[PDB]
Amino acid sequence: LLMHHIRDCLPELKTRINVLAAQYQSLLNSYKSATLLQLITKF
Amino acid sequence: DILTAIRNATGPRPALFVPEVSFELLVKRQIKRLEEPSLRCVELVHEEMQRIIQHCSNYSTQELLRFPKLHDAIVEVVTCLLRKRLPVTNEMVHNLVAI
Numbered sequence: 001l002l003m004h005h006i007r008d009c010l011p012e013l014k015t016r017i018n019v020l021a022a023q024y025q026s027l028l029n030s031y032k033s034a035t036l037l038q039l040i041t042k043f
Numbered sequence: 044d045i046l047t048a049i050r051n052a053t054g055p056r057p058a059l060f061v062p063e064v065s066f067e068l069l070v071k072r073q074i075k076r077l078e079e080p081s082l083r084c085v086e087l088v089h090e091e092m093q094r095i096i097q098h099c100s101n102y103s104t105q106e107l108l109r110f111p112k113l114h115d116a117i118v119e120v121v122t123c124l125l126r127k128r129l130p131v132t133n134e135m136v137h138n139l140v141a142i
Contacts, residue, residue, distance in 0.1 A: 011097070011100075011101055019090070026086055026089075026129070
């Protein structure tokens with residue numbers, strides 16, 4: 001019975017977790033010799 | 044900024060025509076400002092899809108409520124698929140913009 005009562009609100013927690021994970025993934029989109037050569041060429 | 048661009052276009056020697064390099068750089072910079080709307084639209088669409096999926100699972104599948112394990116598995120699979128597809132969609136949008 002206690003678990004059934006808990007399940008009444010678990011979907012909301014799952015949705016919140018999914019939204020947070022999606023936001024975190026979205027934030028991840030944008031945040032030596034080759035680099036030196038590129039810098040020299042740019043200069 | 045306009046005065047600086049004009050001075051660069053004029054150059055050391057006398058000249059009046061504006062080199063196309065400055066115009067190309069300015070237009071590219073202006074166009075680059077259009078990236079954020081695309082990301083915002085993608086995020087809004089993803090959130091709307093997640094809300095639709097949650098509503099369908101909770102309401103449109105009342106029978107599925109009798110098997111919470113299956114519901115959890117379906118939700119996890121859908122979330123994994125969306126996470127996998129998100130970078131592909133972002134790369135496609137970036138390629139389309141760069142084209």
